[PDB]
């Protein structure tokens, strides 16, 4: 009965380039949303996003290698390095084989796809970079990391849109428990704030168009919500077997105890008004942890700031909690951070973990006027302090009706 | 101790639009490789590929839905439907919840990415289709299938390039055994025979340029090999728990008994001359099945027809087998089929399975003049007949040094 705990953290987010900075900014309710300026947004209905400010990998990635990797891959490597360093783990010859990676992305290298495609249109197959494939594909973060640290254990990449971070982390954990590994760096990286990403989600009408007030655009569960806001970044956790951790005396942020998956089987984009999909996923994670819905202090919602989306999620929370409806804390850091797509579940598992350490829960900012008959406590504007929270639940409900939920336990 | 068996098959390949047709063509050594004709290949160094001929989904997908999905998604849905039909499985209200999907792709919707990108370049963000994201992203086959059959169990998508089919199938199986599901449709779909796919792998110099003889281009382990050949298609298996299968009396093609994963941790594209990565993965699958290397009758190689690639793989086969070096049958159907990237491990798991049913092993065609000191039996030109084969091993060693191996057992 192998148990899995967390002993390493790494992150780049719209509100910070480290774990603690990011975390401090969120408990302070700071918004990471600003107007986009790396491409001309005149024709774009959405002109703002959650960008990573002053990203630097100079000391981490040789500019000779940077040319071979899209921005999402660069974000992922960096957050991966932070996670490995913070872990203290030393990779030995007898170690390698048992240490792996489960890192994905929802969309991958949009930037270098557009670049290479632009080059092919203007100058034919020759303008295409010899690094096109490996610089864009979703599995290249796990690819580069394993090589960088000589990792030789199981290596996978889950690509389930919005649910990627949660899926990757949960399977990295299943892998360990199963016996396939002792250590796994799991998470997701994303950088979809490009013309194709902004115009594409805009073509679907899934995005907020509140350009006058970008920081007020992401407003989950609010009456004036008009779509999600895009966020760039990456979240990485070092997962590891309990005894292998103790035997080495490493910090242990928390324990991963439940993981549940479900499918809506409703529509390619819309969730059921019902929230049936989400319920199942939260329910399976509880059953998996072997606890009840009442034992959960905080739920980091999917809460993307979509009319139909936030309503499905609330409905599901009421459905799985019942009485505990208002007794539980539910918040969406997407209010300050935006939607990190493939990295969303990664960064949010980290908030779910940090919340346990600090007994503090981040707010759902911008929640000026709640919805119709919501009975839930969405930690409305300021961070709430908590007393005896032992378990936290993290939710991701993505495109294609694919849902997941992670449950973390204190110490 | 939940056991997993195979009870449904589906496939589209360059040598057939059904499982049996494809399978018959391969035992007959037919090549599926032909010159590309859907785009102007004048500037292209590679002008041929393994295409799917006369693909039809008219009766399966409403042309109203086709517009919302890239060719790889259409191939995947169809092969998914075949698999579900062939399985005989009936989805009930009390059933849904326990039936899921693990389907990926290495590159996803290149075609609709190029189209949408071309539209944005010529006419701005407006020309972008509102279906851009859901029509291109890797998880949309599992997305559409779950909805189509009202599947509500765990739903994931592994995107590990060349190793996707194997990873998806192996995790679909881990999922079932774990208790998370009873039924899982697992596999991969791919359609990278586009300007971006052909020019991109061409920019890396990873592809064969033998345009005079396209059917002779894919020649694994041969002296005149000059890169892999691209193949389009999709392979889908219906995996399911042993008792749930019996209780329903369904055909049972075979049993999935081992699954191993490893990472090279060497280079982003090249495998170690060593073959260390591959060894580990085959070795873990054996250990996982609980059998020895001698108990394996056939190994469906990764064998892509790359100088460095085929050599690493042989080295690893010699390394894991030792004495059994020539006593075991190893062949690459990539010789007739080309490299299906994300679907490669899916179609090949199916060949690995069918080989057990029929006690026949498909040949490595084009193997005119083997390599230096190869001691292995690569089933050189014609299909070999076998007597008491009980286990077969399937290998995928992909970009980013991510490797996997599946072991199937008779009956």
Curated annotation (Swiss-Prot), chains A, B:
EC primary class: transferase
Residues forming the catalytic site: 162 (for beta-ketoacyl synthase activity), 302 (for beta-ketoacyl synthase activity), 339 (for beta-ketoacyl synthase activity)
GO molecular function: 3-oxoacyl-[acyl-carrier-protein] synthase activity; protein homodimerization activity
Residues engaged in binding platensimycin: 269, 302, 306-308, 339
Functional pathway: Lipid metabolism; fatty acid biosynthesis
EC numbers: 2.3.1.179
Catalytic activity line of the entry: a fatty acyl-[ACP] + malonyl-[ACP] + H(+) = a 3-oxoacyl-[ACP] + holo-[ACP] + CO2; (9Z)-hexadecenoyl-[ACP] + malonyl-[ACP] + H(+) = 3-oxo-(11Z)-octadecenoyl-[ACP] + holo-[ACP] + CO2; hexanoyl-[ACP] + malonyl-[ACP] + H(+) = 3-oxooctanoyl-[ACP] + holo-[ACP] + CO2; octanoyl-[ACP] + malonyl-[ACP] + H(+) = 3-oxodecanoyl-[ACP] + holo-[ACP] + CO2
UniProt KW Transferase keyword: yes
Cellular component per GO, a single term: cytosol
Family per similarity comment: Belongs to the thiolase-like superfamily. Beta-ketoacyl-ACP synthases family.
Miscellaneous information on this protein: Identified as a drug target. Inhibited by platensimycin and platencin, which are antibiotic produced by various strains of Streptomyces platensis, and by several platensimycin/platencin analogs. Also inhibited by the fungal mycotoxin cerulenin that binds in a hydrophobic pocket formed at the dimer interface.
Oligomer and partners: Homodimer.
NCBIfam families, per database record: fabF, PRK06333.1, PRK07314.1, PRK08722.1
Function in brief: Involved in the type II fatty acid elongation cycle. Catalyzes the elongation of a wide range of acyl-ACP by the addition of two carbons from malonyl-ACP to an acyl acceptor. Can efficiently catalyze the conversion of palmitoleoyl-ACP (cis-hexadec-9-enoyl-ACP) to cis-vaccenoyl-ACP (cis-octadec-11-enoyl-ACP), an essential step in the thermal regulation of fatty acid composition. Is able to catalyze the condensation reaction when CoA is the carrier for both substrates.
Protein's recorded name: 3-oxoacyl-[acyl-carrier-protein] synthase 2
